[PDB]
């Protein structure tokens, strides 16, 4: 009988299952899941700043519409449009609705520079059965439906803005459809109207069409909406005989500036997370995550596997 | 593993050795004892948190980025806009797995290697004095005490002290 | 003289030759091509429904043109489009023509759903020697040529239909750009027409353009194909008052639903695959594939080499 | 390969090793014999086809995407798709490229691996009574009939049986 | 005592840190840097073909404003936009301007194909003090300004050119849009103009409008570009009543032709190099590169690392 | 390393070792001296060569791309062609990251790997005549002159010629 001394390393009776290159299945001592698969359920409002359009959505918010006044001046990282969002006024439509949703979104303000505008030979301040603020007609606090002047003519407009400011101007404004002639010129006298906007760069020039549409808070015309930026140095004419839906001043377009839009419904809660989903927030320390393709901040990277166990022991043999 | 060691030569682990990842159990005059060995139980942790701290780094921060989600049919803008996000998801979903696969095959081998080392050490330790009994252990030619235990497990253990015992019990 | 054993491994005459992370020949017992080169040269009609174009392309089908007709009511996961498909009916042109193919290859569908509409004051089914079905004049099957009624006025059209069911319809109609004044006022009156279709939440407007364009089947004029979807519960109008191609009902969108159009010109076969190109099937169950980046169905990953080789077996060392 | 055995201190193989991947070679009094080894084969054998499942699995299938070919030059639009398409296709190349390389660098150091676990094997199996001769072979410093022989290849051989022999014949 | 010998591996006084799998520094005894960092600050005329665009942007370049004359006949593998280019003529908008940006860009040519065209009824070679040519009234190279004829009528438009060649046509051709009624009947006589441009596949319809835009280079109207491709075989129609800016000829498209468009301000060196960046050339063997996204040619992959340590050598142990 | 001879039981390395990777040191009867070993030093710089030239191959060629800096905001399409190229350049320097840390775990690992082929390539030319120190040098229990010395390094030494001699100098 001599003395032996055995090497030999430590077990656990429960060992975990990891892949490897050549296995599906082999039980190490210990390992930890890289793969987020839980989220708050609520929206965190740390560290992003957050403003929920509640019943607006953001372009709504953007013209003024009757339930979006609270939405007027705000910032922030995202901006949370809701399903419950209603259009609350006169019906209308925007081409490529999507790049001028974007370019608000990122712009990360609902801040108006409000300008005085000198609309010569037409009455203002437009308003409408379709748009109602507390019982009473309205219009998108943004916009200025102009019309002929009363009992005379759709005086011609040339208004001209110069951008004599350091940030790029965003201009919204628009052009009314009319359901009828009679309407047409009820309203501009002309038979048919005419809105150009431009710049010395680009420009817009629309011909209203007459016609029936779809009733929509009984309203059979449309609105179309339009935008034009406006570099430093660079000027905007409004240039119409009638039919033109005018602006009362501009946005300030802010270059990728670190803003977005999320389309959610989950409350925002009180939490603090860095990561934004559709679903709720992510607060993880996990390279990957199973939770959303739409992930908004510091987030683990998507992907589409529901578990990625890492070893972090050796091979687990109790037996 | 590429060794084998664990999972080979060493028929099982211990688990009772709750101290360490790797260690020493004795056999001499006075009884028997475990021991934990803290080099080759220290080199593998750290080379498996080193591994850890790699890859957390936080480093995707996206904010705007473009719509994933459709409320209706446009065709050739949006089939563009969900192809790109669909290549992408494949594309990182394809390292993932690849990552822990390979992730998982080298920290076995890791393992597998310092524990390889140890005993490895001790051989080295043990000169003529002792045998490889083909299970981790080894016959230990000598008398040898709980002080001359500890000298193996701290490294202070000179061959030369027992080598004529040593020899002497083995080519006899 | 002791005796000795010896330790060794299996080779063969002839290895085979794999790369490695140091070497680009390496010689090893066996290996496995991961990359896929060879097609079957016909279509594989199972287990992927087709439906062969032939001599119509998928607009023509839809729109319902003289060589068309078996394309009726037909549904697909594949929709094959032709080299050799023509044009057979009037000559038309369609505004963002790829938008329109792509949402119908994605519905996976020509199942016309056929809808009585009546037209007031108005002559209908036009006809043109340049849409000739068995020798005599025809016309898209699924449009109504309007023109006026029969000597008198293009009465005012305003139809509307309203989307009662559970699916979004789309509604295929056009607009007719005469060559000359005299063919304008021969056939609608007016001096200038007009076309508008709207829904409650987007619309358009049309003024068809009188000029000269290239003789096609002895047609100077063309016809403009445009395209309106209306979700359940909205509804659709059409106004003119002149120069309206009209619809005969509408087709059912399905969302994402697993279709598409291939542009191949092999002959369906026999076989069986469930990955299919432009150049024929594939039929492996390697990872990778040099066929073609156009692979449709469950198919290998395309990828620029033609050769791949796994190794799967030790070094070969013969010598 | 890492563990230096195959192309490596064993010389060659040996194609007539037809029944196996691994096997024992060895001269006696009664002549000479070659033969498998189970374990040692199917060890490789279970890593390569394990690594070859992992591989196939299907999942890629796609159906509506995107045009990947065009007959008009357009400009904004087409340049996008195209560059998607270009940007995917060279990432998957990519991918490719290393999986094969990288799945054939393991491959072999796991065929190397596992001739030099044999190996191992059998020397701690011999103990005292063999000695290695550098080639792959060892010397076995006693007599062994054919049922020895297998007792080896088996794994049922007792060293201590032929202990004093052995040890005898090499020391003297 | 006996005769010892020892193995042992060099090293070196100072190594290099890499980082691997588990370890972020580890000190080799050599490695090479995988990241280009520099690039040379000109960019090399060789072996790619340049064009420096100078003053003029390709656009200008193509219809042929008063400083481009040297742009003609020119080819490249890459065009040079300077951010000093200016415009020099008329003022004018282009729809879609980049995409035919792009499709110039990729023919790698402006080499014009001069066509002698009967415009019956007009006056032609319109000129403007927009637009000078050492100090007189010009306009571009490439267009021709239709006007009525002096004192009559714009005797209608009727012109067509078939594509009898070999290779698609690419024609340039706007639209005048004048700052008034006046302005639209001394030019054009009729009220308002119409042009329409046709193949036997495609078709554009156009009219113009009339308004105030931003004075530039003292005038308040503006030209749209527009363009049609003409496959071999195909005719293409001018049609107009007013309005026409016309073409003399026509561009050769080659396909996906290798060629592109740099913006970069960097001077022309006589360095060679096959990769061009917006911030000089590179001249490297190394995989990838830290110096610009933009990168044409034969190129190291661009990453966002600075540094990427490959180890070359074993681990160093100097003490 | 994997296999605890760099960085291992061989202490440290030799700054005067200048015209190879891997060498001899001995100590004999008529002084001392240092020589490099071509082998083992030639199959380390081939393995390191060769995955150098299989980094570098120029296959990257691209002309007209899309734009990837721009002057204005247009929303949809810009947003597109940004995601886009940014979606490529996170998943190759990802690409990049994990290609050299794996690039050099493996370059560390065989560079361990050569270090101990060498070592055991001696263990086994020497026999019964030597005895692993532990350091990575081996005690020779017999004379050995500067030509049986430079007989280890060229592989010719003849373990049977001094077998007698060292068993004894070893066994008592």
Redo the contacts between chains.
């Keep these: 009988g001599?003395?032996?001394?055995?090497?030999?390393?430590?077990?656990?009776?429960n060992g975990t299952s990891?892949?490897?290159?050549?296995?599906?299945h082999?039980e190490?001592v210990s390992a930890?899941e890289?793969?987020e698969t839980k989220h708050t359920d609520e929206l965190c409002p740390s560290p992003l700043k957050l403003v929920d359009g509640q019943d607006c959505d953001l372009i709504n918010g953007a013209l003024g519409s009757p339930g979006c006044d609270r939405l007027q001046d705000t910032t922030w990282?995202?901006f949370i449009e809701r399903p419950t969002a209603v259009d609350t006024c006169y019906?209308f439509?925007v081409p490529?609705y999507?790049?001028?949703?974007?370019?608000l979104?990122?712009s990360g303000s609902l801040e108006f520079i409000a300008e005085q505008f000198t609309w010569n030979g037409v009455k203002v301040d437009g308003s409408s059965s379709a748009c109602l603020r507390g019982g009473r007609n309205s219009f998108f606090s943004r916009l200025n439906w102009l019309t002929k002047a009363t009992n005379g003519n759709y005086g011609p407009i040339?208004v001209?803005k110069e951008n004599t400011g350091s940030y790029?101007r965003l201009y919204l404004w628009g052009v009314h459809?009319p359901s009828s002639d009679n309407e047409q010129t009820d309203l501009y006298k002309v038979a048919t109207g005419?809105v150009?906007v431009?710049?010395?760069?680009?420009?817009i020039?629309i011909?209203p069409?007459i016609?029936?549409?779809?009733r929509?808070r009984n309203q059979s015309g449309?609105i179309s909406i339009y935008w034009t930026?406006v570099?430093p140095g660079?000027?905007?004419?409004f240039?119409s005989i009638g039919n033109l839906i005018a602006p009362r001043g501009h946005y300030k377009?802010s270059?990728?500036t670190?803003?977005?839009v999320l389309?959610s419904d989950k409350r925002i809660g009180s939490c603090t997370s860095p990561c934004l989903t559709?679903k709720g927030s992510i607060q993880s320390?996990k390279?990957?995550q199973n939770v959303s393709?739409?992930?908004?901040?510091?987030?683990?990277?998507?992907?589409?596997?529901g578990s990625?166990?890492?070893?972090?022991?050796?091979?687990?043999?109790?037996? | 593993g590429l060794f084998g060691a664990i999972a080979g030569f060493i028929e099982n682990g211990w688990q009772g050795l709750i101290d360490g990842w790797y260690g020493f159990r004795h056999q001499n005059a006075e009884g028997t004892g475990t021991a934990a060995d803290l080099k080759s139980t220290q080199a593998a942790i750290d080379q498996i948190n080193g591994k850890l701290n790699r890859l957390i780094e936080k480093t995707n921060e996206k904010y705007h980025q473009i719509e994933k989600e459709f409320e209706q049919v446009e065709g050739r803008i949006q089939d563009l806009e969900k192809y790109v996000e669909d290549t992408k998801i494949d594309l990182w979903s394809y390292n993932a797995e690849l990552l822990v696969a390979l992730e998982n095959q080298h920290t076995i081998d890791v393992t597998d290697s310092e524990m390889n080392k140890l005993f490895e050490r001790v051989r080295r330790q043990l000169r003529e004095n002792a045998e490889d009994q083909g299970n981790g252990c080894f016959e230990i030619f000598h008398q040898c005490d709980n002080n001359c235990i500890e000298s193996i497990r701290n490294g202070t253990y000179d061959h030369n002290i027992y080598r004529d015992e040593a020899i002497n019990n083995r080519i006899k």
Tied chains: 1, 3, 5.
């Excluded at chain 1, 001599?2 to 009776?13: K, R």
């Excluded at chain 1, 990891?18 to 599906?24: A, E, G, I, R, S």
């Excluded at chain 1, 999507?98 to 370019?103: F, G, H, K, W």
């Excluded at chain 1, 660079?234 to 004419?237: E, G, L, T, V």
């Design positions: 001599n003395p032996i001394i055995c090497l030999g390393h430590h077990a656990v009776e990891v892949k490897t290159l050549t296995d599906n082999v190490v930890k890289l793969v990282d995202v019906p439509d490529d999507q790049s001028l949703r974007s370019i979104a990122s040339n001209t790029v459809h005419r150009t431009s710049t010395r760069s680009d420009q020039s011909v069409n016609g029936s549409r779809p929509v449309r930026l570099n660079d000027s905007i004419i240039n377009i270059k990728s670190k803003s977005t389309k559709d320390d390279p990957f393709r739409i992930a908004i901040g510091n987030c683990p990277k998507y992907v589409k596997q990625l166990m890492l070893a972090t022991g050796m091979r687990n043999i109790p037996g």
